[PDB]
Amino acid sequence: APQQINDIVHRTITPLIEQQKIPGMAVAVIYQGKPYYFTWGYADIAKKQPVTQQTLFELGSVSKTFTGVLGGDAIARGEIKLSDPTTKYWPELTAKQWNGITLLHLATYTAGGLPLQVPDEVKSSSDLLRFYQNWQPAWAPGTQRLYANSSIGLFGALAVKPSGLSFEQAMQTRVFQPLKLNHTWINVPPAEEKNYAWGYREGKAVHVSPGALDAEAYGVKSTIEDMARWVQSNLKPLDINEKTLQQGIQLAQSRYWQTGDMYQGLGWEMLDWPVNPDSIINGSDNKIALAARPVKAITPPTPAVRASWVHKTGATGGFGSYVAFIPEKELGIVMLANKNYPNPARVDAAWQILNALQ
Ligand SMILES: *C(=O)[C@@H](NC(=O)/C(=N\OC)c1csc(N)n1)[C@@H]1N=C(C(=O)O)C(=C)CS1
Numbered sequence: 001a002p003q004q005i006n007d008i009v010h011r012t013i014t015p016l017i018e019q020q021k022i023p024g025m026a027v028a029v030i031y032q033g034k035p036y037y038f039t040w041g042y043a044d045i046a047k048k049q050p051v052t053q054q055t056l057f058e059l060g061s062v063s064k065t066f067t068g069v070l071g072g073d074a075i076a077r078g079e080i081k082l083s084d085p086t087t088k089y090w091p092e093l094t095a096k097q098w099n100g101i102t103l104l105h106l107a108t109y110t111a112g113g114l115p116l117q118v119p120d121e122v123k124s125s126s127d128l129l130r131f132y133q134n135w136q137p138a139w140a141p142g143t144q145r146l147y148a149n150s151s152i153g154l155f156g157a158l159a160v161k162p163s164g165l166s167f168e169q170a171m172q173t174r175v176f177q178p179l180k181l182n183h184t185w186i187n188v189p190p191a192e193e194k195n196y197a198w199g200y201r202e203g204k205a206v207h208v209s210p211g212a213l214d215a216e217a218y219g220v221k222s223t224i225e226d227m228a229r230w231v232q233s234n235l236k237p238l239d240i241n242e243k244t245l246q247q248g249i250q251l252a253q254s255r256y257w258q259t260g261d262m263y264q265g266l267g268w269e270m271l272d273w274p275v276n277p278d279s280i281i282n283g284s285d286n287k288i289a290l291a292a293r294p295v296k297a298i299t300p301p302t303p304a305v306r307a308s309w310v311h312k313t314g315a316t317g318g319f320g321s322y323v324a325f326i327p328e329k330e331l332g333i334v335m336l337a338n339k340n341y342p343n344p345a346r347v348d349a350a351w352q353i354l355n356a357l358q
Helices: 003-020 063-076 103-107 125-134 149-159 167-176 190-195 224-235 243-252 277-283 343-357
Strands: 024-031 034-044 057-060 199-201 204-206 220-222 255-259 262-264 269-272 296-302 308-315 320-326 331-337
Touching: 003 024, 003 034, 003 343, 024 224, 024 343, 034 224, 057 308, 057 320, 057 331, 063 103, 063 149, 063 167, 063 224, 063 243, 063 308, 103 149, 125 149, 167 243, 220 224, 224 243, 224 320, 224 331, 277 343, 308 343, 320 343, 331 343
Parallel strands: none
Antiparallel strands: 024 034, 024 331, 057 220, 199 204, 255 262, 255 296, 262 269, 269 308, 308 320, 320 331
């Protein structure tokens, strides 16, 4: 690692870990296309098992980037269109409020106020239908962006229906394996249990629990090395040999809606580079990130702009993650931690590091 990398990383992350009391953390910085790795702390406190290159973390909502890209792949395959009504793939959703709600809306949180979370009481596919059939929008389709598991989650589950494959098998066969993410799982197999960090919420060790649309919204676990490879793949989709995966990646970074200075892709979110740091830092605070905001349609969507800051936050009960990258400058960062700590702290650190290297 060039000194400047070490310099910044240690200066920025160390106090961050101490400030946020983070038990374990892994950081990857992609600099002129190459990854550089840093780990701190314990994956398992009680076991005193260190974080390593092989430790799996719960990505939480960073999983949405996989879901957007898989969806992008399905479009490229000619299997769905984002202009398809949701009812085309779920005909049992017959209540009148669904008419005019398209896959684009679900994927980009503009269906009209689908809720932030699918309620814990929703378990069976029966509950799931009832939940969406009873939901009442707060706004008309395509007018407001309200960040929501239940929106992008539904998108993921429906996007895979023409393939006939489950969501997990589609993700594994169409995205993980081709990008050679061999330590990335929706369901961590036994041979990896020893590498799967615990999360910590107020001192208690926790792992995410089964939830409806969990795999689609928040259920990916991956290592720092596989997450660097995800970033490289999204920095440079042209190096990618699978035609439809290449195209799916590019579509996930198309700009479909603008709210303030951000643009909504499929999973990914984007801003023009150069970016005002206050804007992404402050925008990451849940009082803005979770608020409803008006959207302007970009008709037709703007193709992936290389001069972009492209990013996504995610968290579970016990974990906190952030990924950001700038395709023009071949620069990116991954931050995985096994405590959920405030979004703006992550984004601030990330900006300090990548600003210092740009
Ligand atoms: C994505 O990260 C997603 N987060 C979650 O669904 C969960 N927690 O967030 C704190 C979650 C899933 S299972 C479990 N026990 N907890 C969305 N992001 C946020 C966020 O913090 O950025 C949310 C507030 C909930 S929805």
